[model samples]
Every structure is written in C-alpha cells, then in structure tokens.
Target: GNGQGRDWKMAIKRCSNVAVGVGGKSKKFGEGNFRWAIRMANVSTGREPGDIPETLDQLRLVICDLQERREKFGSSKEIDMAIVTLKVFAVAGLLNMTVSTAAAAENMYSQMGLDTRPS
Candidate 1:
C-alpha cells in the first residue's frame, strides 16, 4: 500500500468527488463557484485505473470545450478556476493516499522507501 500507485488512486477519488460536487446540475451544485468542480473531478478521477478512463475522456472533452470558449472570449478565468480546484483536490488526495499506503506497508513488515522500523 506504500506504492505511489495507491496514492494516485486516492488523489483521483478526491478530485472526482470535488468535481461531482461542483458540476452537479442540481440547484446546489450548478452554482457559479462550482462550475469548475466538474472539470477537476474528471481529471483527477479519470486518471485512476478501472472505469475511470471513460470519466477522463469526458473531462478531456470538457477541457477542450472550455479552451475553445476561452479562445473566443480572449480569457481563461473559467478554465483556470477549474484547473486550480482540481489541483487542490488532487494534491490533498495524493498526500492522504501516500500516507495511508506507507502506514500499511510499515504494518506489513515492509519498508516504504525509508526506515520505518521501531528503534
């Protein structure tokens, strides 16, 4: 569990949750502040192995559409907002995943790229 792979998986989950919260079409999720949420969720969640590939593809399409809009408007604030939100979620998710994996590895009598044995 101390593998970077596990960490990436956790990061993907976190970003996906954030994206869903923001991009949800419901009145609570469709607000302006949540507009970028969906995009970030797609990037973070889509990168994970399994059914995430489709989600990632959808996110890619969303990013492309956003870019096109930016080109037309001569600004990228909207896209930037989504990117930043996704980055935040991804970072947090990665950190948590890494920590959890390392702990699990240590418990299993395996070192997680460092000396974690009791002194």
Candidate 2:
C-alpha cells in the first residue's frame, strides 16, 4: 500500500510549524503597535477571514524596503530568523528561489541555528 497518491506536499506545508516571533514593519511595533499587529493578524488570518494573504499585503511596505527591513521584534534573532520564516511562509503562499528567497527558507533557517523550515 504505497502512499504515492497522497498530497505529501501539503503535509510539508502544514508540518513545518513554527510561528515567526518577529516583524518587519518599518516602525517598531511598540506595545500599542505590536498589539495592533497581533489584532490585525488575528482579524485578517487568525480563524476569521484566513487572510494570511491579506496579512502579507498588510506588511508589504516594510518588507519591501531594505532599510525598513530591519524593523522587527525581540532580539536581533527575530530579524534574522523569524523574519525569514514568516516572510518565506507568507511569500510562498503569496508567490521562489534565488539568493535570498523562500525556497531557501529551510537553508536560511539552518544558517541561524534554527534547523527548521518555514512555518
């Protein structure tokens, strides 16, 4: 009984679970801002509208700009790891592989000592 017909790829997408403990918005998500970000995430994607795509749109500005790219939460690790995962997860759903892309998210993670793939 081979499991060849199963949607194995979906399992990969689902099993790679790890919430990104970071943010890439230009402005720091201060108490209030972070609160808003969470709320927005919840409202947009969290069991409501399942708007992760929309959520990605919500963060388009900061993620796009290189300088603003540093904006994040927690230690610099957030910028390094979390940002990479979240962005890869989001971008994968939204859109690849090059030098710094989602397909390499697993690789990106390993470099940070995370050893996990995108969530």
Candidate 3:
C-alpha cells in the first residue's frame, strides 16, 4: 500500500477545505471587489474557464506580477482589494509549501473572525 498516495489525497482534501473559508471571507469582506480577484485566480489557476495557458509556474508569475506591478492605492476599496490580494498570495504560498492543514484551518478561521480558543 502506498501511504504517500493516502497522504497526498488527505492534503488536498484539507486544501480544498481551506479554500471555501478563504474564498467566502474575501468575498464578503471585500464587498464583491475581491470577487473579481477570485475570478482572476480561478481562471489563472485553471480551476475555471481560461483561454490562456495554465500552469502553476505561470500562475505564480501572474500572481507575483499583480503583487509587484499593481498600483499602490489610497482609496478604501482599493485598499481592501490589496488586502485580499495579499490573502490570496498567502494561501498560494501555503499551498506550495504543503504545510499542516490543522494550521491552515486555524489561520483561515482566525481571519474569518471565529474564536477557537478554548474557554
């Protein structure tokens, strides 16, 4: 039996779980602006319709370009967009690292404003 395969599946299960938490947070918190960014990611990551070549290498380049090339903003909505962009960046980083799902869940939950501390 290949334990590695089992572990790999479990890891993706957790990652898929994490996305809903992150996506809903960005969607609601950014007031639909982040929805645009999520759409960008969906197509960029090839999770949805995309005409361009889709690969993690290309996705990383696209995400990094947005971070590096996007204009610095002062408007409140723009600022919020930046915040969520950073959030997507962070999750992407984690996904690349294949870190512990328990930690990822806690991080996402914390960002979502749920107190997980024991009473």
Candidate 4:
C-alpha cells in the first residue's frame, strides 16, 4: 500500500490511543497524525450541517480518544487544545460540531471540511 494509506491507519491508531498516552499525546493527535487528520479532512467531502455522526471514522477516533481522557492527567497542553476546539462545537448526544456546520445549510456549502462532518 501507499505510504499515505499507511499514514491514515497510523493516524487512526495514534488517535485511538492519544487519550491514554500510548503516543504520549494525551488525547491529542499523534504529533504526525494530527497533521494527517487535517490534511485528510481537507481533501475529504463535507456533510450537511446538524450533527456529528458516529459513522465517521475520524469521529470514532475522537470519541474513543476522549473517552480515555475523561480522568486525570499529567499534562494538558496538547489534549486541552484539541479538546477545546472540538468540545466548543460538541453538543450532548452529537458526536461533533463538524466543519460543515460552518457552511450554509440552505444550499451553498463551505467545501469538504472537518467536525468530521459526514461525507
């Protein structure tokens, strides 16, 4: 497989464990994975505004990542930053406030984006 594909999987893995410090990010992006997430999200499609779907792979990473971070922590820099951004848009029952939420729900949209807005 291409290196990029491996990167996605790696990103997923890093994201999966960030909360527990497997990569020592404490729920933040694997230093390298964070960039990959943004890069991939930019090239991916955006979904209609409303909520973060659990079906989103990126979100699953985010959710699971955060789940482990629910307790205490030794540091909060990276995790805090990432959590704050996503948490800002996060609503009860919803997975996220995905990037597409920034777009027009009527017709015009803001290009494929984050918030892990479904595609």
Candidate 5:
C-alpha cells in the first residue's frame, strides 16, 4: 500500500484507542484515565476517518475536531502537551512518505500556538 494508506490505518487505530479510552474513563474516572482520555482525544480527533475530505480527509478532520473540542473543554495542559508530542512522533514516521501527516500535525500545533518544533 501507499504511505498515505498506511498512515491512515495507523491513524484509525490511534483514534479507535482514544475513543475506547474516553468511553472507558467516562464509565470510571480512576488514576489518570481522564487525562489519558484527553490525550487520546487530541490524537484521535486528528486522525480518525469521518465524513469529510473522503476517507483520508475525514480522518484528518476528525482528529482536528477532537483536538479543538479538548481545547474548548479545558483539558489539562500537561496531557494535551503530551498528546502533541506523541502526535509529532507519529507524523515524523510519515516524513519519508507523504507530508500530509506532518502538515496536519503542524496545523494542530499552530491552532494550539505550539512551537511546532521537530521532535
């Protein structure tokens, strides 16, 4: 498969995990589960496939939406920062392939006023 396809798959998996974590934490807020949920949401929203930009664009849009939601809802800055860091790593993995992943990550960081520095 092409790089975008592979990246999309990875993004979907990450998003799925985030959704699961959020649902689980909503059921029981133990330890840092709430924070984990927010972190996952940040990553997931940018990567998950939704109804826009076809499947690829949809995935990116979902992840972006989740990130925005977390910001609006006032999630923990530490957790959000962690999420951004992890997301940068994920995008870096796609550096040899398409720049879309990296671009998306940059956009997200820009939205958050993050430094967008390479990891």
Candidate 6:
C-alpha cells in the first residue's frame, strides 16, 4: 500500500547486486585497510566481526546505512572515503588470511570512483 517503500526497495536491490560485485573483485588480493572496511560494513549490517551474510538483505542494509549517513552528513567527505573502504571489505573476509592447501572460502571492491572528489 506504500509507494515510496516499494521505490526504495527497488533501488536497494540494485545496491545488493553491486555489493556482490565489489565483494568478489576485492577477493583478488589483500590488510589493515581491508580490515577496517570490513568492520565498518559489518557494523552497518549489524553483524559481528568475521561474519558474513548469505542473504542479499544483509548487503542491502549496509547500502542503506551508507546512503543514510551520506544523507545525514551532507558535506562530510570523510565518511564517503571510509565507505569506499567498507565496500572493499564488504566482499572479502576480514583477518585470518591464509593461503591454504586446496582450501577455500565463500564468495563476494575497488575502482568504484567513490573517490574523494567534489560532490
């Protein structure tokens, strides 16, 4: 019965897809920057450290939070830069890095032009 909610939902769906893309590409290589980003993303999604979500909704929440924070701050470019890192960590696992013998981890940022530029 609500028009705006539906509109917002549609937009957030795209965001979730972008999250997966960022998450996947970032897994290519990896540190502190990545760890901080992952922590921020986890906090945004209300998850614990070293935890990841299997559902798209989790990523959507992270997107939504970043969106709201930007909306609230308006002129704070600092958060924007920070969010860029979060997007990176969003896909890769934080901490516990290991090049194991035929072992692996589950799926998921970079070059996102979320660069610190004039808005």
Which model scores highest in TM-score?
6
**What residue runs in model 2 are displaced by over 4 Å at the alpha carbon?**
1-56, 65-75, 96-119
Candidate 1 vs candidate 4, TM-score winner: 1
Q: In angstroms, how far off is 68's CA in candidate 3?
A: 2.2
lDDT of 3 by residue, 1-119 (tens): 12135543443343443332334442122223334554554553445533221333443444444444444422354433543443433343334433233345435534644222222
Query: Which stretches of model 6 miss by more than 4 angstroms?
Result: 1-30, 41-57, 75-77, 89-119
| Candidate 6 lDDT tens digits, 1-119 | 12135443443233332322233443332334434544665665466765433333454455456657677757355555445544433333222222221112121232333222322
Candidate 3 residue 72 Cα shift, in angstroms, is 5.4
Candidate 4 or 6, higher TM-score? Answer: 6
For every model shown, what is its TM-score relative to the native structure? Answer: 0.31, 0.30, 0.31, 0.25, 0.32, 0.36
User: Mind giving the per-residue lDDT tens digits that candidate 4 earns over 1-119?
Assistant: 12245544543443332232433334433434444333332233242222332333545455334534544443355554444333322221123222221112101111223333333
Q: Listing every candidate in turn, what is its Cα RMSD in Å to the true structure after a full C-alpha superposition?
A: 14.5, 13.3, 12.1, 14.4, 11.4, 13.5
Q: Give the candidate order by descending TM-score.
A: 6, 5, 1, 3, 2, 4
Ranking by lDDT: 6, 5, 3, 1, 2, 4
Residue range 67-117, candidate 5, lDDT tens digits: 566667767765465444334433432222222332355455456443333
Worst 10 residues of 6 by lDDT: 99-108
lDDT for model 4, on a 0 to 1 scale? 0.34
TM-score of 3: 0.31
Off by over 4 Å in 5: 1-39, 42-59, 97-119
Q: Native-vs-model 1 lDDT?
A: 0.37
Candidates 4 and 5, the one with greater TM-score = 5
For TM-score, candidate 3 versus 5, the one ahead is: 5
Which digits, one per residue and each the tens of the lDDT, describe model 2 over residues 16-100?
Answer: 4322323232222122222233334434333332222233344343333311334332236334443444445433333322223
Q: lDDT value for candidate 6? A: 0.40
Q: Which of the two candidates, 1 or 6, achieves a greater TM-score against the reference?
A: 6
Residue pairs with backbone atoms closer than 3 Å in model 3 (clashes): none
Against the correct fold, how does model 1 do in TM-score?
Answer: 0.31
